[PDB]
């Protein structure tokens, strides 16, 4: 007989039972209680009674306001008293006074006369007193072993909270690119480019690399502010296949592969920036790139595709938004970054940025994986021109088709989705780290 | 298909050779790795601050419960976890009257106010360590929650005060009254400003494991580690007061498996590049820093590192590495790793509401990868980061190393935050305290300090 049996008001005293049982098992005092036995049978009370009558050597009793009220605690107490009388032992029962509110009178009449080890001041002092008594009463205990406590704790509290070998499919914010213009052209404009002329403000993207003009557009594609180009000769222009550049096989001393790829990146970014002008999507200036959102009332009830892409938070209106960047390694894609932009009425913008960031964090708190995914996909499909992709305008004949369906990633191990307890608890909380 | 890889939880060694992932489960269940026996306090603050500290110590002695004990477990009580006596009986309390703080707090500009008030709270501690024969393990600075409120962000009182103590090597822990007596401070309504009620027990955990650590404590240590893994963390801070835009300060946090890192303050010089805003080191100071770290490691361990991973938030140029590869023993493998934070690769999930797991990683190539240090962890049944997790881009910029090994090391280095007893963190410890250590270094520029552990930095 070595088990240190404990009775408590579960689930009112599960934490204390687990802590004390693990401490006593680690120090060698073998323990028994309702917890640690999740494989409960049809008749658990029979096994509990058998343990108390036969196997238990000491009967600790978690004494709390709800310990005496609970019926199971009282039944276990009565069985303990019966066994104690059968054994004729002075201290076969030990009340652990863990609750301050439990008054002297409120203590159950069956344990009022039994001296109670104190835990109200400190759990450590109570454990010291219990160990001192167990030494005095010569309670058996094996050599100290803290490995068994670890294994039991893992098997009990960490059995339904371990990753599972299950496959999950994730939707990224990287939107593929289907086709590029056939060739990239470097025009020999030389003097035809006006001095101190900002090529950024052009109908089509163009980078004034060296003395040339690099772009996918044809030589005559621009004539409004460049009339002299009507006399340009296509013989001087240099054509580099885009497929060769992307594949990297292209090698020439005029320009290295990396610079060409950076030029293509800038061209794609400018193409997206120009293309979003045609769409009925607003503009918000980020730190370096640009962000695009939807104003109030443009959609029917702000619910494109039955997805709320605009709504109201307190006195302001939040609009979901995106921002586009370009990547070519390891495969050409458009990076999309979700944003939330908060407006006084739904058509203007909030000048301040601190309010923007604070409201962004506050609204992100209330949104989660499904909301972010749905809003991003809805916005991207809104920007679509057909059911397959949307096109950016590089030239009069050349266009870049950017898909509207993000690249699919896959894991190998996953978990199980419990109820939204995190949403229930984390809600309305800020600044606790 | 852009397949991902899962890298298991690093697992952390505790007392009696017990390996548990959560910081505050194998701590309570077993106890600290090193069993230091006395945390005699030296609280410094107002009398009301002393009362708050005494009441909070009495609370800590008794169990404190969390509303959600599945995610934030409880605190069984200090002596029931750390098996050492930290009570209000032994305290070398040193008083500062309210008017004393007031006269040093009303100095117009935050500049003079902060300097004078930090000197006020520093002279007392220096005198206590000098002229008293009762050497207290840790000095607790219970600052009333008006210095933190009135004297808001050199800035960052918390940082300047800790920085002007490296020469004296006084292990100190700084607390705010609102952090301790959060119920007492309340807004216009009856609801306290900082509602810790659902995480009250959590507040008891971090406040304890930190205080134990600064009192010569080693709460935990990495379990699986290689024989010589010296991790260098190159912090960086532009000196805004310097007339030269190139001028900047740097250091190097050296980490073994022990999780207690040594800070090697560097030399202030032209390390900034305004054209592209990239920290870079010239051959002379690069060699100086590497030699300092190498000699310190040899002295502490008796032999030179077998491997040396220098983590940084930017890319090392060729001058830096060609200097590093010179002052380094042939029998050594030097690697340089760039750890960018944003690098947009958000991975939303089609299934439901909860976020992606924590061990998932996307390996771009043999020299680049993405790691999800934040998100949802089954053990906590909660998302470490709200919203959708942001990945972490890791590239082996210089040197030859296995990308999977670097990813595993970077994930393991997230479990070494003694200051906050949490399951894990979103950054490796080498660069986690980069801004904090940078501000500390900027505060302490003229004075040159030797290699010192974190107990005087964080």
3-state secondary structure chain B: CEECEECCCCCEEEHHHEEECCCCCHHHHCCCCECCCECCECCEECHHHHHHHHHHHHHHHCCECCCCCCCCCCECCHHHHHCCECCCCCECCEECCHHHHHHHHCCCCHHHHHHHHHHHHHHHHHHHHHHCCCCCCEEEEEECCCHHHHCCCCCCHHHHHHHCCCCCCCCEEEEEHHHHCCCCCECCCCCECCCCHHHHHHHHHHHHHHHHHHCCCECCEECCCCCCCCEEECCEEECCCCCCCCEEEECCEEECCCCCCEECCCCCEECCCCCCCCCCCCHHHHHHHHHHHHHHHHHHHCCCCCEEEEEECCCCCHHHHHHHCCCCCCCCEEEEEEEECCCCCCEEECCCCCCCCCCEEEEEECCEEEECCCCEECCCCEECCCCCCCCEEEEEEECCCCHHHHHHHHHHCCCCCCCCCCCCCCCCHHHHCHHHHHHHHHHCCCCCCCCEEHHHCC
- Looking at beta carbons, which residues of chain B come within 8 Å of A329? 364
B285 and B393 belong to one structural domain: yes
CA dihedral sign of residues B414, B419, B420, B422: positive
- Looking at beta carbons, which residues of chain A come within 8 Å of B25? 153
Nearest CA to A59 out of A94, A23, A20, A32 is that of A94
Q: What are phi and psi of A240, to 5 degrees?
A: -120, 120
What are the binding residues of B? 419, 457-458
A274 and A144 belong to one structural domain: no
Residue the block writes with tokens 């917890």: A35
Token pair for residue A77? 């107490």
**Closest residue, chain A, to B380 (C-alpha):** A161
B247 and B138 belong to one structural domain: no
B301 and B432 belong to one structural domain: yes
Q: How many CB atoms lie within 10 A of CB A227?
A: 10
Q: Does B369 map to a domain?
A: yes
Provide the residue range defining the domain that includes B175: 35-214
Q: Does B2 map to a domain?
A: no
Q: Does B24 map to a domain?
A: no
Say which experimental method was used: cryo-EM
Q: Does B161 map to a domain?
A: yes
Which contacts of A37-40 are long-range, i.e. CB under 8 A and separated by 24 or more positions?
Answer: A38/A156, A38/A159
A144 and A257 belong to one structural domain: no
Instruction: Give the DSSP H/E element, type plus range, for residue A273.
Output: helix A257-278
Residue A121 to residue A124: CA distance in whole angstroms: 9
Domain end (from A130, A157, A184) = A157
Domain end (from B214, B235, B260) = B214
Number of domains in chain A: 2
Residue the block writes with tokens 């009370």: A45
Helix (H, G, I), strand (E, B) or coil at A179: strand
CA torsion B114-B116-B121-B125 (nearest 10°) is 130
Residue B52 to residue A119: CA distance in whole angstroms: 23
Q: Does B416 map to a domain?
A: yes
**Closest residue, chain B, to A339 (C-alpha):** B387
| In contact, B357 and B380? CB cutoff 8 Å | no
Q: Does A431 map to a domain?
A: no
B105 and B157 belong to one structural domain: yes
Contact A87/B at CB under 8 A: no
A218 and A103 belong to one structural domain: no
Q: How much of chain A is helix, strand and coil, in % rounded to 5?
A: 35, 20, 45
Q: Does A432 map to a domain?
A: no
B202 and B241 belong to one structural domain: no
Return residues 319-378 of B near A (CB < 8 Å).
344-357, 359-360, 362, 364-365, 376, 378
Residue B136 to residue B309: CA distance in whole angstroms: 37
CB-CB under 8 Å, B386 with A158 = no
- Looking at beta carbons, which residues of chain A come within 8 Å of B365? 330
Q: Does A433 map to a domain?
A: no
CB-CB under 8 Å, A121 with B29 = no
Residue B194 to residue B181: CA distance in whole angstroms: 10
| In contact, A212 and A193? CB cutoff 8 Å | no
Provide the residue range defining the domain that includes A104: 3-157
B80 and B152 belong to one structural domain: yes
Number of domains in chain B: 2
Q: How many CB atoms lie within 10 A of CB A282?
A: 19
B176 and B256 belong to one structural domain: no
B183 and B281 belong to one structural domain: no
Q: Does B143 map to a domain?
A: yes
Q: Does B315 map to a domain?
A: yes
Domain end (from B169, B189, B214) = B214
A142 and A178 belong to one structural domain: no
CB-CB under 8 Å, A432 with B199 = yes
CB-CB under 8 Å, A337 with B344 = yes
For residue A82, give the CATH number of its domain: 3.40.50.10140
Contact A22/B at CB under 8 A: yes
Q: Does A201 map to a domain?
A: yes
Q: What is the resolution of this structure in A?
A: 3.1
CB-CB under 8 Å, A407 with B77 = no
CB-CB under 8 Å, A410 with B80 = no
Return residues 377-436 of B near A (CB < 8 Å).
378-383, 386-388, 420
Residue B219 to residue B421: CA distance in whole angstroms: 9
């Amino acid at each position: 007989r070595n088990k240190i049996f404990i009775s408590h008001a579960t689930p009112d005293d599960n934490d204390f039972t687990r802590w004390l049982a693990l401490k006593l098992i680690g120090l060698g005092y073998e323990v028994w209680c309702d917890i640690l036995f999740l494989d409960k049978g049809v008749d658990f009370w029979s096994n509990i009674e058998k343990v108390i009558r036969e196997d238990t050597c000491k009967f600790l009793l978690v004494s709390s306001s709800y310990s005496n009220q609970r019926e199971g605690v009282l039944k276990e107490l009565a069985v303990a008293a019966k066994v104690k009388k059968q054994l004729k032992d002075d201290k076969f029962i030990i009340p652990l006074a863990i609750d301050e509110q439990l008054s002297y009178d409120d203590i159950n009449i069956d344990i009022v006369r039994l001296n109670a080890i104190d835990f109200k001041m400190s759990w450590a002092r109570g454990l010291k007193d219990i160990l001192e008594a167990f030494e005095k009463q010569k309670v058996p205990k094996e050599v100290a072993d803290a490995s068994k406590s670890n294994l039991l704790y893992q098997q009990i509290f960490l059995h339904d909270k371990s990753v599972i070998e299950k496959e999950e499919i994730y939707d990224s914010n990287w939107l593929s690119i289907l086709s590029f213009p056939e060739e990239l052209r470097f025009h020999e404009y030389n003097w035809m480019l006006p001095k101190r002329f900002d090529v950024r403000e052009l109908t089509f993207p163009a980078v004034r690399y060296k003395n040339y003009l690099c772009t996918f557009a044809w030589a005559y594609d621009f004539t409004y502010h460049l009339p002299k180009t009507e006399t340009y000769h296509k013989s001087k222009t240099i054509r580099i296949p885009t497929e060769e550049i992307l594949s990297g096989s292209y090698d020439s001393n005029f320009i290295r592969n990396a610079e060409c790829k950076r030029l293509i990146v800038q061209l794609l970014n400018k193409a997206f920036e120009l293309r979003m002008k045609d769409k009925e999507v607003q503009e918000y200036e980020m730190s370096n790139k640009t962000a695009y959102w939807l104003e109030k009332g443009k959609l029917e009830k702000d619910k494109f595709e039955k997805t709320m892409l605009v709504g109201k938070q307190k006195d302001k209106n939040w609009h979901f938004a995106i921002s586009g960047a370009s990547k070519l390694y390891p495969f050409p894609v458009l990076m999309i970054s979700s944003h939330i932009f908060f407006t006084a009425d739904g058509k203007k913008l909030i000048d301040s940025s601190s309010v923007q960031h604070s409201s962004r964090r506050r609204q992100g708190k209330n949104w989660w994986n499904n909301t972010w995914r749905t809003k991003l996909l809805a916005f991207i499909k809104y920007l679509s021109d057909d059911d397959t992709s949307f096109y950016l305008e590089m030239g009069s004949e050349e266009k870049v088709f950017v898909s509207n369906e993000p690249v699919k990633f896959k894991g190998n191990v996953s978990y199980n989705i419990p109820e939204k307890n995190t949403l229930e608890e984390e809600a309305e909380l800020s600044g606790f780290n | 298909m852009k397949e991902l890889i899962y890298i298991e939880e690093p697992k952390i060694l505790f007392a009696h050779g017990q390996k548990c992932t959560d910081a505050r489960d194998g701590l309570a269940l077993f106890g600290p790795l090193n069993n230091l026996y006395g945390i005699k306090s030296g609280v410094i603050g107002t009398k009301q601050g002393l009362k708050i500290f005494r009441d909070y110590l009495d609370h800590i002695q008794k169990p404190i419960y969390n509303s959600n004990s599945i995610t934030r477990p409880m605190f069984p009580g200090f002596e029931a976890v750390f098996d050492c006596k930290w009570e209000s009986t032994g305290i070398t309390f040193k008083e500062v009257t309210n008017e004393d703080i007031g006269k040093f707090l009303y100095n117009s500009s935050t500049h003079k106010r902060t300097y004078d008030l930090v000197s006020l709270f520093i002279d007392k501690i220096i005198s206590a360590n000098k002229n008293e024969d009762e050497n207290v393990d840790v000095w607790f600075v219970i600052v009333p929650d008006e210095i933190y409120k009135y004297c808001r962000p050199d800035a960052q009182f918390h940082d300047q005060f800790k920085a002007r103590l490296l020469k004296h090597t006084i292990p100190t822990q700084i607390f705010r009254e609102s952090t301790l007596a959060w119920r007492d401070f309340k807004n216009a309504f009856g609801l306290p400003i900082r509602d810790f009620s659902k995480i009250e027990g959590h507040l008891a955990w971090t406040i304890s494991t930190a205080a134990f650590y600064k009192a010569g404590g080693k709460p935990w240590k990495l379990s699986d580690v290689r024989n010589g893994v010296c991790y260098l963390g190159l912090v960086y801070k532009k000196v805004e007061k310097s007339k030269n835009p190139r001028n900047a300060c740097c250091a190097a946090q050296m980490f073994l498996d022990n999780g207690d890192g040594t800070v090697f303050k560097g030399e202030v010089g032209p390390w900034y590049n305004p054209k592209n805003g990239q920290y870079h080191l010239e051959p002379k100071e690069a060699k100086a820093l590497l030699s300092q770290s190498l000699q310190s490691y040899k002295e502490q361990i008796g032999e030179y590192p077998k491997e040396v991973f220098i983590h940084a938030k930017t890319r090392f140029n060729h001058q830096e590495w060609d200097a590093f590869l010179e002052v380094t023993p042939k029998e050594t493998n030097l690697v340089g790793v760039t750890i960018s934070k944003t690098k947009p690769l958000k991975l939303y999930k089609t299934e439901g509401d909860y976020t992606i797991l924590r061990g998932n990683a996307y390996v771009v190539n043999e020299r680049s990868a993405f790691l999800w240090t934040v998100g949802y962890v089954p053990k906590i049944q909660t998302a470490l980061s709200m919203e959708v997790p942001n990945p972490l881009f890791i590239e082996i910029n210089k040197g030859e190393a296995d990308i999977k090994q670097v990813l595993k090391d970077i994930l393991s280095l997230t479990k070494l935050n003694y200051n906050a007893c949490i399951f894990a963190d979103g950054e490796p410890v080498t660069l986690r305290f980069a801004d904090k250590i940078g501000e500390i270094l900027t505060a302490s520029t003229d004075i040159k300090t030797p290699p010192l552990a974190f107990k005087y930095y964080i």
